[PDB]
Every structure is written in C-alpha cells, then in structure tokens.
Amino acid sequence: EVSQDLFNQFNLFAQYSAAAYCGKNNDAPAGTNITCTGNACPEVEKADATFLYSFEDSGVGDVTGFLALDNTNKLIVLSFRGSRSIENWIGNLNFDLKEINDICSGCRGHDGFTSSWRSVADTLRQKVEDAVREHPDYRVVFTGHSLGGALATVAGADLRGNGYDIDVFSYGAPRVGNRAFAEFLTVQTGGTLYRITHTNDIVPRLPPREFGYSHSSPEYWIKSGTLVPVTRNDIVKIEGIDATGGNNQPNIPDIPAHLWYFGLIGTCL
Amino acid sequence: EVSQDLFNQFNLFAQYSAAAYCGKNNDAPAGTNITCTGNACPEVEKADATFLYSFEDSGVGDVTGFLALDNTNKLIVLSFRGSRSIENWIGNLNFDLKEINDICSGCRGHDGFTSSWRSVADTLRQKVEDAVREHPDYRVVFTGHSLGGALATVAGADLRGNGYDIDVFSYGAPRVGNRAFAEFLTVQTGGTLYRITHTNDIVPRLPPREFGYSHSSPEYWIKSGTLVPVTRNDIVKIEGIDATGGNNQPNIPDIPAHLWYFGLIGTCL
Numbered sequence: 001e002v003s004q005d006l007f008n009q010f011n012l013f014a015q016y017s018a019a020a021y022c023g024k025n026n027d028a029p030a031g032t033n034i035t036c037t038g039n040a041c042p043e044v045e046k047a048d049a050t051f052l053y054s055f056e057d058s059g060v061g062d063v064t065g066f067l068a069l070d071n072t073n074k075l076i077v078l079s080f081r082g083s084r085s086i087e088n089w090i091g092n093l094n095f096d097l098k099e100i101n102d103i104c105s106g107c108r109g110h111d112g113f114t115s116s117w118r119s120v121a122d123t124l125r126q127k128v129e130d131a132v133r134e135h136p137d138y139r140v141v142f143t144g145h146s147l148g149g150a151l152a153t154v155a156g157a158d159l160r161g162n163g164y165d166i167d168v169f170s171y172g173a174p175r176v177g178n179r180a181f182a183e184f185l186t187v188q189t190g191g192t193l194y195r196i197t198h199t200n201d202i203v204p205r206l207p208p209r210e211f212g213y214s215h216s217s218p219e220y221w222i223k224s225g226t227l228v229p230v231t232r233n234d235i236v237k238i239e240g241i242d243a244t245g246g247n248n249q250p251n252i253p254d255i256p257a258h259l260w261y262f263g264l265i266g267t268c269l
Numbered sequence: 270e271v272s273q274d275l276f277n278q279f280n281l282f283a284q285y286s287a288a289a290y291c292g293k294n295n296d297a298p299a300g301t302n303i304t305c306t307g308n309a310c311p312e313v314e315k316a317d318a319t320f321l322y323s324f325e326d327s328g329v330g331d332v333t334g335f336l337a338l339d340n341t342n343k344l345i346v347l348s349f350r351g352s353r354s355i356e357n358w359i360g361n362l363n364f365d366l367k368e369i370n371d372i373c374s375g376c377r378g379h380d381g382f383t384s385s386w387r388s389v390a391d392t393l394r395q396k397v398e399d400a401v402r403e404h405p406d407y408r409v410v411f412t413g414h415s416l417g418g419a420l421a422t423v424a425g426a427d428l429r430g431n432g433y434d435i436d437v438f439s440y441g442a443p444r445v446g447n448r449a450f451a452e453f454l455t456v457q458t459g460g461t462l463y464r465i466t467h468t469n470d471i472v473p474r475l476p477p478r479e480f481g482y483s484h485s486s487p488e489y490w491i492k493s494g495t496l497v498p499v500t501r502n503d504i505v506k507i508e509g510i511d512a513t514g515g516n517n518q519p520n521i522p523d524i525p526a527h528l529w530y531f532g533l534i535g536t537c538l
C-alpha cells in the first residue's frame with residue numbers, strides 16, 4: 001500500500017528513532033559511529049553514520065536525542081527519544097494546550113511538547129544549519145517515537161522554509177495540537193510529514209479529541225501485529241484530518257503495540 | 270534442518286515458557302483460559318488451554334510457573350518461569366555443585382537449581398500425577414526458559430520412568446550439572462529433552478565448564494539473529510556432549526540473544 005522504497009524509509013527511520021533509546025549515546029564523543037544494543041538499529045549500523053551532536057536532559061523539558069550524518073544514504077537525521085518510561089509518561093500526561101501563533105495562527109499545541117522544544121530550539125537549530133551547508137545534496141530528516149515523535153513534529157513545523165526541505169518521520173506520536181495546527185501540518189511546504197501508527201497503539205490516541213486535539217493528514221497505519229514483521233503490504237495510507245479506520249478507532253487500545261514499529265522500539269533488549 | 274512438525278513444537282513451548290512470564294497467571298483460578306499480554310503466546314491462546322495449577326514463589330527457591338491443560342494438542346504442560354531480572358540473576362549465580370545420586374549415579378547438579386526443584390517436587394509430582402490420571406492419553410511436557418528451563422530439565426530427569434513419558438523443551442537453559450549428569454540427560458529414556466539455544470546467548474554458557482559443568486546432547490541451535498523470525502532452516506542439530514559450534518563458541522556472549530527464542534521471551538512488552 002506503499003512503495004518498496006517508502007517502506008524502506010519508514011523502516012530506516014524507525015531504527016533511527018529506536019537508536020535514540022538503545023544506541024550508546026550517553027556521553028558519546030562527536031564523530032563516533034552509531035551503534036545500538038540488541039539489534040535495534042542494524043540498517044543504521046550498516047551505514048556510514050556518525051554522531052554530529054548528542055543531547056540528554058537538555059533544556060527545560062528534558063529533551064534527549066542526537067543529530068547524525070549518513071554518508072551512505074546522504075542524510076542529516078535528528079532523532080528525539082521518547083520517555084525512559086512511557087507507561088508512566090502516558091499516565092502523567094497533561095492535556096493543556098498553549099497558544100502557538102509563532103508556528104501558525106490560531107494554532108494551539110500541547111503545552112508540554114511545545115515548551116520543551118522552544119527551550120532547545122535555539123541550541124539545536126544552529127547545529128542543524130551547519131550540516132545542510134556541508135551536505136546540501138543530503139536530505140535533512142527529523143524523527144522520533146512516542147514523545148520523541150511529537151518533538152520531531154513540532155521541530156519539523158517550527159523549522160521549515162529556511163532554505164532546506166525538512167522531512168519528518170514519527171512513530172506512535174501523540175496528537176500535538178489543535179485542529180488549526182493539524183491543518184497546517186497537513187499542507188505545510190518545505191517537507192513532508194510521515195505520521196506512522198501501528199494497530200491499536202494508544203499513544204496516537206492521546207490527548208483525546210475531546211480535549212481539543214486533532215491529527216494531521218495523512219496517516220500511515222501498520223496493520224500487522226505486535227512482534228510481527230512488517231511488509232509494504234501491511235501499511236495503509238489513511239487520508240483526511242482525524243480520519244478513523246486506521247489507528248483512530250473505537251476499540252480498546254494497547255501499550256505493547258506502541259513498542260513495535262517494524263521492530264522493537266521504545267525499549268531495549 | 271528440522272521437520273516442520275518439530276519446529277511447530279519448538280515454537281509452541283517457547284510460548285508456553287514465555288507465558289510463564291506474561292500470562293495473567295499470578296492468582297488465576299484453575300480452569301481459566303491461558304492468555305498473555307503483548308502477543309507473547311498466540312499459539313497457546315489459540316488452543317483450548319487452561320490452568321491446572323499456578324504457583325508463585327513456591328518452595329525454597331521462590332519457584333514460579335504453572336501447570337496447564339491443553340486439549341487441542343493433548344498435553345499436560347508444566348512451565349517454569351525464569352528470573353524476574355535475568356541480568357542480576359546472572360550476576361548472582363553461584364557455581365556450587367551438590368550431589369544427586371537420587372537422580373542418576375555419579376551425578377552432581379547445580380546446588381541452587383536442584384535444591385529449588387527438590388523443595389517443590391512433591392507438590393508438583395502430585396498435581397502432575399492427578400493430571401495424568403485424569404488424562405492418560407496426554408503427552409506430559411516440562412518446559413521453561415532461562416532458569417525456568419533449568420528447573421524443567423531437573424524436574425524431568427527426576428520424575429521420569431514412572432511409566433509416563435516426559436519431554437522437556439528448554440530455552441536458553443544454563444548448564445545444570447556435571448558430565449555424569451549430562452551423559453544421563455543425553456541417554457535417559459521415557460521422554461526426550463530438546464535443549465534449545467540461540468546464537469551467542471550468554472546463559473547456556475553458564476555456569477562455565479571450568480567449574481565442572483557439562484551440557485547434555487544434542488543441542489538445537491538457532492542461527493537467526495535477535496528479533497529475526499526463525500525458519501526451520503535456521504535451527505541446527507549439534508550432536509556430541511560439550512559440542513562447540515552451536516552456542517558453545519569462543520566469542521563474546523550477549524543478553525539480548527537470551528530474550529529471543531522464536532519470539533520475545535523472558536520479558537513482557
């Protein structure tokens with residue numbers, strides 16, 4: 001339901017997203033090769049990818065992640081890590097919205113995710129600009145799973161049209177703002193947003209629509225089971241804001257589904 | 270390199286072993302359907318399988334597991350759960366042997382494992398017997414992963430030749446006794462033992478042969494990677510006591526390899 005090529009990018013950034021949790025980045029030297037424990041990111045290892053900068057508990061919302069260069073694929077990946085503990089993170093979740101005219105007008109976004117990014121958008125924006133210029137023929141990409149996915153999306157909105165096209169791949173990302181914002185994310189130029197969901201996974205269902213949140217379009221839904229391998233024939237593109245019939249359905253949601261995006265994600269073996 | 274049927278059996282008991290960690294099982298009423306969270310045991314769920322007896326922290330080794338009834342595949346299954354923290358369990362493992370001429374002559378076995386089985390053998394032999402009585406037509410199978418696979422192996426060598434066959438399927442089980450014992454476990458009749466290992470899994474390398482431990486024969490070694498699906502051409506039968514070229518190879522071992530045996534095992538999503 002997507003091309004073999006699109007599937008491959010979904011799989012590759014699924015792993016880049018995974019690395020935010022299982023790569024040994026902790027205070028890892030700039031320039032080092034990116035590796036992950038427990039086979040979390042083989043395709044990243046299979047490439048000429050190195051850390052260009054790494055961050056932890058960075059800024060006011062404790063953002064954590066890393067920026068990287070892929071000479072094999074010609075990319076400049078910014079990966080955001082989600083919570084060290086997603087289950088608790090899910091229950092501590094606050095649904096409060098906050099004015100974000102700066103991104104767009106009449107756009108309201110999750111206060112937490114937005115504050116977290118502004119606080120770090122300065123340090124990180126420059127680190128990114130330095131890279132395109134060196135690798136201008138290299139696709140810049142923003143990625144993240146769970147909370148990390150939300151952070152990647154906000155950054156992907158806050159940073160478009162400065163010169164370079166920013167593509168975003170999010171995995172099991174929560175809703176990030178109000179209907180206006182979803183509208184924006186669905187049509188914004190200077191990039192494409194790939195919002196990937198899996199089976200019933202609960203995070204893409206929060207905050208609720210009943211708290212004023214809304215999802216951008218389209219949605220790339222993975223129909224294959226938890227712990228089951230994903231083929232191109234298992235993903236479905238679902239068009240239209242807040243479309244239902246994908247991950248946005250009225251059944252009982254699940255947390256394990258959130259940890260399986262093409263592989264093991266959000267946790268390390 | 271294995272018959273589709275044996276493969277299906279390996280997969281089935283990997284799940285029964287996985288069920289010992291991810292089933293609801295902690296206080297469930299006998300008669301209750303066996304289910305697991307995070308898609309840890311679809312084959313067991315798809316079977317008319319129920320709890321015959323659940324035990325938690327029983328005896329002196331804080332043994333945990335369950336006795337089950339499967340009418341779909343006609344089995345009585347005794348599944349032992351490995352440790353709740355395997356890395357710490359690995360670190361605290363002590364290599365002490367203790368004499369076990371009751372099991373076989375010249376036989377010495379890991380004090381801990383043998384001790385722990387001993388403390389619960391009466392109750393379990395009992396419940397197993399009731400089950401057999403009620404189901405003469407049923408194949409009795411002991412199974413377990415990591416420490417649970419050790420207990421499974423002991424229990425089975427202990428209660429065999431009571432006129433009922435015992436098959437044992439262990440997943441990443443440590444060495445359990447001395448060479449005399451290994452030799453026994455290799456030739457004992459009234460039920461086969463299928464030792465199953467994966468790649469560079471660390472546990473089947475403990476305790477070290479250096480401390481007087483040995484591995485029974487044969488060994489079913491899974492060649493496929495961690496998080497990679499197993500096909501019957503990925504399993505290799507390694508004949509010979511203390512045979513190398515399976516899991517017993519001179520390279521650095523890995524814990525993640527321990528948590529994969531034809532699906533996620535020893536941990537729950």
Ligand SMILES: *[C@@H]1O[C@H](CO)[C@@H](O)[C@H](O)[C@H]1NC(C)=O
Nearest residue numbers: 032033034045046047048049
């Ligand atoms: C870094 O990656 C390259 C090519 O992908 C590999 O040859 C190299 O050995 C890795 N770095 C180190 C320091 O081993």
Ligand SMILES: *[C@@H]1O[C@H](CO)[C@@H](O)[C@H](O)[C@H]1NC(C)=O
Nearest residue numbers: 301302303314315316317318
């Ligand atoms: C348990 O499994 C059986 C058949 O495998 C089924 O008919 C029964 O309704 C199930 N129980 C529950 C509570 O779903």
Ligand SMILES: CCCCCCCCCC(=O)O
Nearest residue numbers: 092093094095096111112113
């Ligand atoms: C004032 C009490 C502290 C509660 C912490 C909750 C953090 C939630 C922020 C968020 O929505 O991600």
Ligand SMILES: CCCCCCCCCC(=O)O
Nearest residue numbers: 358361362363364365381382
């Ligand atoms: C003196 C109390 C410490 C013993 C802790 C139990 C460790 C068991 C050794 C083993 O599992 O092989």
